[model samples]
Target: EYPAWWKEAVFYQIYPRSFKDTNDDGIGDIRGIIEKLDYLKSLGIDAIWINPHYDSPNTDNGYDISNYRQIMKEYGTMEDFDSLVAEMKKRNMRLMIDVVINHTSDQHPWFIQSKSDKNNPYRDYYFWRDGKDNQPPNNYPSFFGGSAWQKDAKSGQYYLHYFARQQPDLNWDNPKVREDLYAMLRFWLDKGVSGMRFDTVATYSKIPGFPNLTPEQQKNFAEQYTMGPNIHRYIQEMNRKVLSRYDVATAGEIFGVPLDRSSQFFDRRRHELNMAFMFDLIRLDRDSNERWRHKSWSLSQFRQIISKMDVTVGKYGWNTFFLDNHDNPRAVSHFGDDRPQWREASAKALATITLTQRATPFIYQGSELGMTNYPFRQLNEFDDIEVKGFWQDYVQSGKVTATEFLDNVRLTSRDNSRTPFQWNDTLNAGFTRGKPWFHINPNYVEINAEREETREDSVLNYYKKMIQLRHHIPALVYGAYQDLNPQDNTVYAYTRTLGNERYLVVVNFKEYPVRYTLPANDAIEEVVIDTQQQAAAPHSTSLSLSPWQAGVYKLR
Candidate 1:
């Protein structure tokens, strides 16, 4: 029914600050990304989604922007960006940049002017409210935790900020705000970028009246705030003013919207967007309100959520096939087993699920090499705002000890995902010649890309092979997804079918062994990808799989 460029594309998302460094600066610049264009081209990705590189104070990485037009001095100049784009263009690869319009850095000129005085014309650009009872206007919770309002020393008022206090919310209720942002969108799109992965897409239209929302509402921000009145209208206006003019792909980082409501953002008839970034994969393991608090989850819940996300968006819009991103822990660690025995196979197994799915696949950096979480034991070494914020609050309240907190949240810290990319076994894992801005995982020597590229059965090579399979198969792009085992706890098996073409993908998430009998036992013709190394079992419908064994097969 559709032939969108992004649906058939394999996107590789790079955390710019962690990707690579040139000039021995210990920071990844646009030129550094250009240096690796050949490497990315070899990986078989069709496009690259670079996280924010705009001028920033580094409050929440680069999500807080002091200036949208200027690249951070750390990331490099416009010429570097031009060279990066030129290199990508030569490889026929596309570029999708992160758009952080939900808020601006406290140092942004607009915020600076807004906070200057009551008579300032720019005061209406942001949400500035008079305090109620000498406290914040409402008990809105920040995405990083704590109040979403900040106190103004000059006026004794409060400003709304859904993320860090340093990133104050823009007043989208003001048409002038939307107008300026639309122009900025055109500026980047005119740079010939291929797409945009908008940050906090649904949180744009904050609820009216600055009401004190329910505790449950604050706990579930996206569900409640995305239900706001002006969100759809704003996107429609944006489409008319900007997006409709481009051939660019778009993805909104949407969360918590119920199965039915997620459609509004992606409905092609409405010209809203092409795809909505789903976070059901994360909620599969962690609690909605507290990411630090681990909750028990199963393969059954995993299948159900994935199945529904496809069903939710496959009708009118599209879904993002992803597990790893910069916001959460590494996919191989969080979704797949990261221990030595299961690391390689489990990493390959996860790729089996991600690449075979009908949605556009987005692979994060280092996950191709099965990068695992850093073993963060002490708070001193941690750098995430969410982790530090909760630690400070808990210690001040005396409700929880620092040791207990770190022990509980070690695997859940967003910092685990921010470690420098493991390029090779060198100082800083060949990521930089100078000291890194963040921690470099101690497992670099064993898990670096240099080690994996030479190994025939390495996770890195498996990704290359799997990506190739998807590239050649039309059915794999637009195929109708049918889950093979809904109630099966350990093994996930599914069939992708389009016209006369049908393919099977099976991966055992847990360690040990499992036998999954195929539905079309008589039809399986040849092994498309057998991570099982089971050349003998290609004709057999009953698969006897080992620890994290994965297979993909074609049906006659």
Candidate 2:
């Protein structure tokens, strides 16, 4: 139930590669983030959870770490990283580095030596096994869509990779391996980082003897790779080894960990992790592990998922509030309408769900500007390794044509969010001076920070106010949550209560006006925040909301 300082903080995630490029390299660097410090601070966020900028082969967009000690050459040198740390502290902001311990890039020296000789000392650093009858050790499929095992031509034994073949899983069953990873964490902790966001901690520990899952278990097979017998032991050992020693906030990317089992990680007394990313909201319309398997969801389903997420844990276990990330499409396009007239309003409405929730808010970059998904019209334009893997599985194999596959990609691709940040309406959307690494979203010219900064009612400013209001009202954070209209298809209504200080929040999810009756008879003292100016009675529980409307009220 207790966290150090991060409880009151709002975090903004930056995908460094595309955030803001400096020095004309067309790749975002530590210097770029340093330059944007003033820009970030203006949003009223307290911390920045920048994705991995470590030396990598970029196979999985930097998730595949080649070296944890050095900064990626394109991002900047260690001195630039030190400058970022120094500058963030000077601005009174904190930092969280993306730590990928579950796997390493095949280009890593350890893997180079690991696959060099069967008797190499680094052989056990990764999971390497013999093939059974010229087939993989098991029939387990990769998260990126093929067999999880890649046979090494030199060693003649297959190594395990839950993701891309380039990302070989580490042998956490090896005690030395755990210590080595912990040492890397200590090195960064010593560098003044205030938080840690563990990458795929669910895959950190593997089951004994690497048993295969049956087809039945493979349905929600996400569970098959999680909660290994030694997982809790390793997580606790990680805390005792390094994390517990620092005054840092910890969050895990709890991929594949069952919702019922999330308590094991966040129960502070267990000394595992402070909070974890419960991915129910993002996984609402698609499988969390396999994003290409798309589906339709309703607002009722959305509300139930949010309600369950809020009540899933006590004060002991906390949750993270986010709808989009570097790995998926922007929130504005996913949960709300991202069109011209409704973009700002919908973004504000979606933000109310985030900042007002009883969880630490994580706002991905450019969401403040009401960014929409990239207009991906074809399949060849996609750059994600996971997308390519799916392309091989579906399109190339004739299961789906290129046009059919791309129609879904337009709706769900991570590249939609990975496009360069639209800072201004410059030649390259002010993201880079040279040729951009990725195509800037077409609408950046109209929707960008430069334009939103001048407008008071802009989505950017609305986010700023919501974050400020959340910070001012402790009830918003610690208050007991209750859903006022749970089954409504077009509206989401709820209240937060802490003693006598109670507040009501209502939001319209449709394009037209929706009339809703408040279940509570509590009278309003003032309208704390309103995105639309629709006239309503101060004391009446009956209300009408305009398109994409969102508001919060204070009760006396």
Candidate 3:
């Protein structure tokens, strides 16, 4: 479904601000990224997805884009970014830039001009509508909170924003807007970048009629704007204009797209995206309010989610395999046991499950050293708008107690992943020579890259082994996958078969020991890889697994 280059690639996402700070500005810049190129190359990754580093007002972090052509002043100059790209290529690595096209900062020149007057030429660049009955056009709620429309007294109208008020949704219906966006895409592709990671690609088009939500639907309303009427046409047009002409890889962050419709975007013949990230698995444990602040999930649910993905698009399209990202909490802390007794083993087990899958795997920054969530005791310590909005609407309003609110914050806050990266067990975790923009996780003293790099069986080394295996093993790249022991809750087991050769991957997700029975016909021919380095014997009827152990056996 995709080019062979992409199929063989392993991606590493870098949160620039938290990755490293060279100038002691407390903020990461292009120079800092250049300094770490060698470190990333040593991890055996083929590509890196750098978060948005464009000019912005810092609302919603860097997602709010003010200028697509220019790099943020704090991040560095255009020359610095050019050098970063050159440095990555020097190490045989490709760069994937985060492209946020669904919306732009209200401070953007185009948006400012659109709101300047009713008949302005740039007025059609964004959505602007007159108030219905002296109120907001409808009860469409912004993702942050309240109505999605903001009153603009200058034009006596309202503009649409799916996220914060400072971010206005673009009017993709306009031909000029589409042309402008396509030109921007070409500008970067001409820069020799390897790929583009589309942000919120599903929300690009709106439904034909702007309808109101029912009173009941108002509680948890979602704009039917995702994958709407004109989405296909727009994507196909972009493909014809830019993507089809280049050898670059493209992936969409399809939020609301169901599994059945994935091929519409990823089918190679359709001239659209190369792959997409489906959130079905991650949304399993979200709270009733559709927030990430929730508890545990059943293994059966995770199996169902993954099975559907495999069946739906396994033969036609590609799936982006990831358990954690900049938006979610660390996988080990949320899914595995992060206690001192089992943290390393659990992290390794999680790595084995993610990397051995049939899909392209992504590793988040600092996850290699088994970083845990920040101990956020108060709300002020956090910086995300969405987190503070939930607290004010639910906790400060007396709907929930402070104790209850803080408990969920510890489990679900985006700030958990936003903490400074721990490179060493020194002051500020060696992230910066001066003060950091955010507080480093206190456990960094014990968990850091410098400490794990030397240890033989550390989490960092385990990840390197898994990554290297994925590259060398042909079956892992193009094997037929089958779920084994589907009903088991404490363990996850699966097989990848390519003709006569078969590989079995087994992981114990629990903190305590568990016993598993081996299949009679499938004999362990060789111990390919193991997280704990304790492999099972050939043709063993029953096996005892240690705490959070993971093994990969070559079966005949």
Candidate 4:
């Protein structure tokens, strides 16, 4: 049997560049994290997953790696990272580092050597194809909104970059390349790193027989580069070479992987990864009627995503459930709650629903605090590659005006999640003594750690209690899930059962009170977990849930 370390673990994600600044250089460093190990321990995080700290040009904010063996000098040395791992373990927490092997900086040694000559031995290590008539070989679009293939004059060939020209996608077809990746994986594991969160892992396997996008979808084609046949082979190799060695839990970012195929990634036979982040919820609003506008998503749709993911996770493999991460907007704003005053209720409702699901819950940094999104009047205030790419696409597609599209970006930009952690109302949100590398969310002053720590009804404490409850109750952790009120328009309800005990979880998604009928069964036992309702329960037959209410019941 696998170890129980992950059964109750709550991962705290750290975007190293913005977490805490040391040396007063405006940019956060590992030493600052080193100084705050006790703070993390106090927060009761079981594991800390750090974003990429690899040596890079930082064009993509450390996701584009120039060197895999050494930490970037701006962040700290390998020694500092080692010290972090040692100290975290001393506090009973695991360290999970981000592995950005999907692509490397165009300035990497291998890419430099490969671009040197036509017959360079390392040329095959990366995707290099001759340009057709000085044009990109196909209509394939990069993730950053331009042609995925970029001309390399030095080699007279086109290199593939799913995101940026500065980041060249590596060819996993090369045996030597995969070996180097395995070596990197083992090196970190040997250094006492407990696990890894694989960044863009789904991107490694590209369609070997590169083909043009279908003419029908050509205009809107984005990320045609990710359509690959050998993607699973790379994953299987990883499972055999690295993940299988230890009980470390690996979470991957996999795109285009259907629900049925999800299990194949985590099955003991496949062993490619332990669990992966599912994007069914995030992608729901991508093609709304107002395609370029902020169309509101409904509670039914949100609950549907959770039910579907639960069914998928139970059917095949384990799924790591999360609402927000470094790449997306803050959940409070992204999920839709116009007023900041109600953020606590919204966060609690979401937590109650998510924690009671079958999948393991992941809480992103500050997500527990009900952090709101930033409101930037200018696009220049944003620091996300995705937003910048979308801005370019809006112009190219002519589907919407720049001003209108940029307004949408400002409200829902990925920068919302990248802002510095709100420690207090102090200068720089208590993140740094100097100006922060990125802007802090303005709402942090009144809705931050200092206030939440002193108030029991605060969102942060609610999150702590929810996490504690999930860890203490086996049904919440290892339960089978069933959606109870899927068709209901206003209420989200699900049942989670472990062994013989079952819990019925109901969430009132709206601000107004809603009445829900009890299941026609007598065995359903219930307890109120949280509510803004006027009355807890008006008799057992019929119940009323006030705005953003949630209740968990112990079923007979």
Q: Output the lDDT of residue 240, model 4.
A: 82
Segments in model 1 whose C-alpha atoms lie over 4 Å from true places: 520-522
Alpha-carbon local distance difference test for all models: 0.85, 0.86, 0.84, 0.77
Which pairs clash in model 1? Answer: none
**Candidate 2 residue lDDT tens string, 1-556:** 3535687789999999999899988888899999999998878979999999899888888899999999998899999999999999999999999999899999998898998999999999998888768798887778787788999887788999989899999998888889889999999999999999998898788878877777766656566889588888999999999999998899998877777888898887788998899887787899554468678898889888888877777767887888999888889988888888888889999988889888889999999889999987677788977789888877777878877778887888889899999999988989999999888887988989999999888889889999999989988887888887678889888888989999888899989988877766577777888887556555556568888888888776
Per-residue error (Å), model 2, residue 64 = 1.1
lDDT tens per residue, model 4, 1-556: 2425665577788888877887777898999888878867776688888989889999999988999988988899988998998898889899988998988998899999988877898888888887677587776777676688888876678888888888898889999999988998898888888888887776788876687778654644433444567878888888888888876778887765656566766664576887787777866665532333565677788778777777666654777777778777777777746376577788788777656666666777787788878878687888787777877777668878878888777666668888888878988888888878888878888778778989888877877777777777887877777777777878887777778878778787788888878787734456636644334534555567777777777766
- The residue-level lDDT of candidate 4 at 416 comes to 81
Using TM-score as the yardstick, the better of models 1 and 4 is 1
Residue 87 CA error for candidate 1 (Å)? 1.0
Ranking of all candidate structures by their lDDT, best first:
2, 1, 3, 4
TM-score of 2: 0.97
lDDT of 1 by residue, 223-342 (tens): 776777888898888889998999889999886566678889998888988998877777677766555766788988999888888887766789888887887888888888898888
**Ten-residue segment with the worst summed lDDT in candidate 3?**
534-543
Query: All candidates' TM-scores?
Result: 0.97, 0.97, 0.97, 0.94
| Candidate 4 error regions (>4 Å) | 1-4, 216-226, 288-293, 336-338, 522-528, 531-539
- In model 1, state the lDDT of residue 30: 80
